[PDB]
Every structure is written in structure tokens, then in C-alpha cells.
Amino acid sequence: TYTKKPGIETVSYADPYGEMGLTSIKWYYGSLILRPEWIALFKTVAA
Amino acid sequence: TYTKKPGIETVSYADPYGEMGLTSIKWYYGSLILRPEWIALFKTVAA
Amino acid sequence: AYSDVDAILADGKQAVAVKHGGGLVVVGELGAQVLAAKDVSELPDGV
Amino acid sequence: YSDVDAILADGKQAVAVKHGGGLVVVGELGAQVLAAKDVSELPDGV
Amino acid sequence: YSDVDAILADGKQAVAVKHGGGLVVVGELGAQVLAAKDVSELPDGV
Secondary structure (H helix, E strand, C coil): CECCCHHHHHHCCCCCCCCCCCCEEECCCCCCCCCCCCCCCCCCCCC | EEEEEECCCCCCCCCCCCCCCEEECCCCCCCCCCCCEEEEEECCCCC | CCHHHHEEEEHHHHHEEECCCCEEEEEEEEHHHHHHHCCCCCCCCCC | HHHHHHHHHHHEEEEECEECCCCCCCCCHHHHHHHHHCCCCCCCCC | CHHHHHHHHHEEEEEEECCCCCCEEEEEEHHHHHHCHHHHHCCCCC
């Protein structure tokens, strides 16, 4: 989580008044299927 | 020399996730040949 | 003709922050389409 | 264009936008039309 | 152009490209073509 409150910390040339503030959330993937044979799936149609 | 290491410090509207890095070197150079008659140069061809 | 920044956003035009000289440039989506063209085939219908 | 790298891979260049959301992409034809003083200097396709 | 000072000396404006990387120069006639909702508001030349 990266958060930049609107103020002097976020002025730059773009916003020389510092009226903007951002947020970010970064993560990664996973799901190393150790034994695919154990995982079982059935398909069907609903009503 | 300046260095904007990736992370929170490089968080902005351009990269809200803050993944870029930066490093710059700046300097001033100048020279003046007071006595060009003292500077001597010979030209030749090599083997 | 846009008096305030909100006018550009309310009208739907985009506004790119400007470095060096000048203060701001306003993006029209046709200009964006014109901007995003590799070959004369990819230009919009206008040009 | 799905992801950002597709812009770079295709040779397109993309700028960041402050006033309002968006990411405008620039092309090589988009370059010279942008850099135009008057009617003289634009690509012949224009 | 050789150096960025020549951009402003000519009167052309230059913007900063961050998402991909580079620097594109915007001219006056380029500004008009950039701000166009439809065919009517391009400059007369185009």
C-alpha cells in the first residue's frame, strides 16, 4: 500500500498547488498446483 | 549525483504504483588556453 | 476558451501536464486518435 | 492495446496525464503532426 | 533539433514522457489538432 496525502509532498511541476492524492495496491500471483490429480471438477447445467 | 530509489519516494501520477528508479550525474566544465603557443602537437601515422 | 480546468474535464477533453515551456495542453479524443497512428492507414476518417 | 508493454513493443510511446484520468499514447506519425508550426511541416499523408 | 533549448527558442513546446520513456515536442499547429472533438474543430490546414 502506497499512499501520498495531498500536500507539499506531491507538488511537482504538474500540480504546483498539491491538490491531488493517490493510492496503490500491489500483489503477486500464486497457485502452484502441487497435485492436479487430487483436484476434481464436475460440470452441469442449472435450472 | 541524485538518486530516486524505487518505492514510496517515486510515487506520483505518472507511476502511482511507484516502480521506476532514477539516478543522474551533473557537472559544469570549462577551459581556457592562456598560451596556445605553449601547447604543441605532432601528427603521424601508426603501424 | 475554457475558463477553468473543470471546463475541459466537464466537456470531456483531456489535459496533459506540460514540462519546460508553456503551461498545459488539452487533449481531444480525435487528437488522441491522430496521435495514435503508425501509418497513414491508421489516421482517423477526417485526415 | 491490452497491457502497457504492447505500446512499447509496437514502438508506440505513452505519456502520463495530470489533469483528468487517461494515458495518451504517441506514435511516430503522431510526432511530426504534433511538432507543427504551420501548414508547411506535416507528413505528406496529412 | 539538437538540444532542448532549441525547442523553446523556436517556440515549440516540449512535454515529458514518463510511462514509456522519451520526450516529444508539441508545436502550435499540433496543439489545435490535439484539441478536436470532431471534424469541425481541426485547424483549417487539416
